[PDB]
Amino acid sequence: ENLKNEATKVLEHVCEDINKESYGFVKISKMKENEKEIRLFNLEEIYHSLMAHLLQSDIWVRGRIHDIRSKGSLAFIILRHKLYSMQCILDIKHNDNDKNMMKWVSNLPLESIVDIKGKLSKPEVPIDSTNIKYEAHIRKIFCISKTAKELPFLLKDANMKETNEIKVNQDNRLNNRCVDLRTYANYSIFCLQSQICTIFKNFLLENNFIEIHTPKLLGESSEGGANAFQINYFNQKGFLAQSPQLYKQMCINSGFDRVFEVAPVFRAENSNTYRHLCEYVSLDVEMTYKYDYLENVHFYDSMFKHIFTELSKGGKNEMLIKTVKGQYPCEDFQWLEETPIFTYEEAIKMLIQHGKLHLKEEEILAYDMSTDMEKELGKIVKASHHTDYYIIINFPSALRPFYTMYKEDEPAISNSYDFFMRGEEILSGSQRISDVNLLLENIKRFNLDANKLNFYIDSFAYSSYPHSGCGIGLERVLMLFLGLNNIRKTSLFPRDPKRLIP
Amino acid sequence: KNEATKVLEHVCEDINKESYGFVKISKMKENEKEIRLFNLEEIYHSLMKAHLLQSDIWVRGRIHDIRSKGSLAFIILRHKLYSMQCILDIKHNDNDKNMMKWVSNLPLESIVDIKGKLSKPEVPIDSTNIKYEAHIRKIFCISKTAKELPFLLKDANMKETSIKVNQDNRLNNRCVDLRTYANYSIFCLQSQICTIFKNFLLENNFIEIHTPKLLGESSEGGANAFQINYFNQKGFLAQSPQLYKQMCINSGFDRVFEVAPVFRAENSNTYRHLCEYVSLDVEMTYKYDYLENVHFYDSMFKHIFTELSKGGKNEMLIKTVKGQYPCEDFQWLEETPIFTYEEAIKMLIQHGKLHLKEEEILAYDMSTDMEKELGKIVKASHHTDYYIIINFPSALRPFYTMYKEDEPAISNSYDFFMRGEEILSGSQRISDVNLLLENIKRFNLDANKLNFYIDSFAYSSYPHSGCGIGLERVLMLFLGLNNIRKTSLFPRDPKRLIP
Ligand SMILES: Nc1ncnc2c1ncn2[C@@H]1O[C@H](COS(=O)(=O)NC(=O)[C@@H](N)CC(=O)O)[C@@H](O)[C@H]1O
Ligand SMILES: Nc1ncnc2c1ncn2[C@@H]1O[C@H](COS(=O)(=O)NC(=O)[C@@H](N)CC(=O)O)[C@@H](O)[C@H]1O
Ligand SMILES: [Mg+2]
Ligand SMILES: [Mg+2]
Ligand SMILES: [Mg+2]
Ligand SMILES: [Mg+2]
Prior knowledge:
homodimer, alpha+beta, CATH 2.40.50.140, BirA Bifunctional Protein, domain 2, 3 domains, five-stranded mixed beta barrel, binds 5'-O-(L-alpha-aspartylsulfamoyl)adenosine, binds magnesium ion, aspartate--tRNA ligase (chain B), EC 6.1.1.12 (chain B), ligase (chain B), protein biosynthesis (chain B), aminoacyl-trna synthetase (chain B)
């Protein structure tokens, strides 16, 4: 059985001089012992340069073993980095016929990280797997991090467009999120999430906004205490912020004029749905207006048209979106140069007219449109206006929060607005009550405790500029832009009433 | 003779006919002509760095100061860090003494729309950085101050020396306090730091991530973590995104940053730390030497200082802060000094600040007071406010810090300092799952509760490093302010949860 122990020695071989040797496990320190300094490439650089310094001589490249197929005297490794994959071929006949090198390579587990020294060349029929259409012929291969554990599922299965033709279910993916995020579509999803944050902030900064950061530990709930997480804050009773609502208004009352925040909020929703989470990233805007709050509404509208335009343009966003759609197909998000705006009353009458809703004229003012009904409206507007994006305005005051300013001449109606993507709410906002006495009256009208809101209310007591604002769900915007079926696909480590882990 | 009160409280019912009064915004809409409403920032940038000078204009602002004498009233109008004097001379308003009475009675902080003519006086007053004046033709109040202010903004703007508006008074009245010229400027500079940080990282191929603050197990140690009941699960608030930013690198994202709150149940109430703050976090891979990333983080901060220190807007913001809170300009070198921890301690010993033998240096855990003493030494010897310490003792760093395999008492760790105080802490990470489990055991932590994090290393881990940065601390130390509560909008500390 000594033969088996010699074989074990080969399979476990640690390389001690990478100048003499062509394979083995190596500490990163020992690549310092190389006679030359190493210019190490990643696959993103290779893709963008090739799809001359890369084709001339042997190069060094690092990547994860996405796939490895042993075929006798040949072995085929697909290296992966981000979105990019490249085939690397070990041919024993080109490596002094070293059978132990092949034995060691065949034994490498998937997802292991290797540094390969090899020569790039363009084959006749390139692998259809790899978006790098060159192949590396391996001269040396060293493993700097060996996979230690059997994978919870295969990336080949996890990447598959889900059909009835192995599905990896959501629980398995979320439980092993650090493997799930390696699929091409999931990588692309979160690159796009970052893009949304960048476009949002850059548009606001170009329009003279400053970024603010307001606390999430509160003494009082921001949007209604029933769904606020409670905390013990040094023997005080505290809550997590459901929104930065109170503080962004306080900042406008303090003179900051145009503010935005990109930050977590926490909502103790006791419903476990496909489209909401208990923790999410709110994009909040608050700003003054001159004489009409519609000034700000048109501004928020231009902001979203800009987001859509920027998400839909350029090579890299196009590639990200196409990569998502490869696994999760959906028609491209559509919007108009003139966003359709409907009043709540008009929207109701449209739904009744299309036979989607039945109400007596008596029942129309108090009617509270369901999320399913908002989706039906989305379908109607998609058919009639050829857009996935529109605005509803003038909600009844009774259905909006206490800080929403009502129409002076028609108080049952408020100066409020929701924006919709594919028939689902992405943004909610309103003209704010900017008179401290009207604000106290509305707080009382809503049976809220003004004493507990004193720090907020007092911020209006030394003048208040006319102002409005909005709050936006980042994960929901991304989900609906891509047409994904669940908000857990656009939150990195989702939180819902059952899931605190990972 | 009660018509005087009706004058004082006058509500204007037609702005085309009248020249003063309280008005509803809807009433302004009744103006016969569309109103091009200017703010003081536009006026400053157009005039101080011609439409505004050939006609009556409309301007909105807050009444910062008001004085009247006879036929003249003087209003200082304020917006952001800009102020401009406006003058009512009722010889040019039909000698309407009632207008003078109504205007003179407006309370401070009231928001007014003024229709007037701009002109450049021979002698502009010194306090207004707009060196033009507005001669008032009409003035309407769209929001009247309702309550007496808790302190005068004139007092709150003064350099401290009789008058002093104390910190508790200010923070209990934060939305008034934030109107001082310095405080406005501080939080504009905070936003500048976030912008420069993100743009530098984006230009270097990073992506922004958002990771949860509701956790099943604390990220930096349970003694200082807030607990929460999460649907009858026992959880914590994140003290940092440490576990998740490493998990994102293990997931292949390669270069990530996060700008987000963290929560720390800090044992103490001190001038330089808070219980909630905004952490700027970076995590990235390296090729063969973690020092690659350290030099990168160093370039990031040099870039931040460079952009904060530039001419134009940022220079005016800094000047405005220093007007109330004077401090020497922040200085940094073209090449950042880097000291090992041992070198830093030996510098303290050489200057007589510490007495340690050689065999005691690595066991010594440098206090914040001694870090400050070191900052003074380095300012005197190297003429910089910014430097780096590397190679902290392993036993004094967190469990995820990789030690030097050939001298394990030392770690591949680093802190960055501004004016002698820590702004950044980070390290090469343990990226071998077996070494990670051993170090977790060595720090007597619970591998089972950290299982979701440990498991993220079990399917390979890239060589990687990272860092965490206190946003408010960076701003505080850049400006030389005496308290971190000056650089956090609504501060949280062990006593203060409100506002
Ligand atoms: N549980 C959840 N999961 C994910 N996204 C969610 C969500 N709940 C809401 N959102 C998203 O957050 C947005 C704002 O939340 S909100 O409608 O409750 N409004 C406001 O809060 C006001 N302050 C805003 C203002 O008036 O400025 C929604 O439109 C969704 O996109
Ligand atoms: N209570 C407080 N108030 C304000 N700022 C504070 C603070 N505590 C810390 N900071 C600031 O946050 C930074 C990071 O915090 S830390 O030193 O605890 N390190 C880490 O956490 C690792 N994960 C980082 C890594 O290794 O990536 C500090 O340098 C301070 O500037
Ligand atoms: Mg809704
Ligand atoms: Mg809503
Ligand atoms: Mg320290
Ligand atoms: Mg520290």
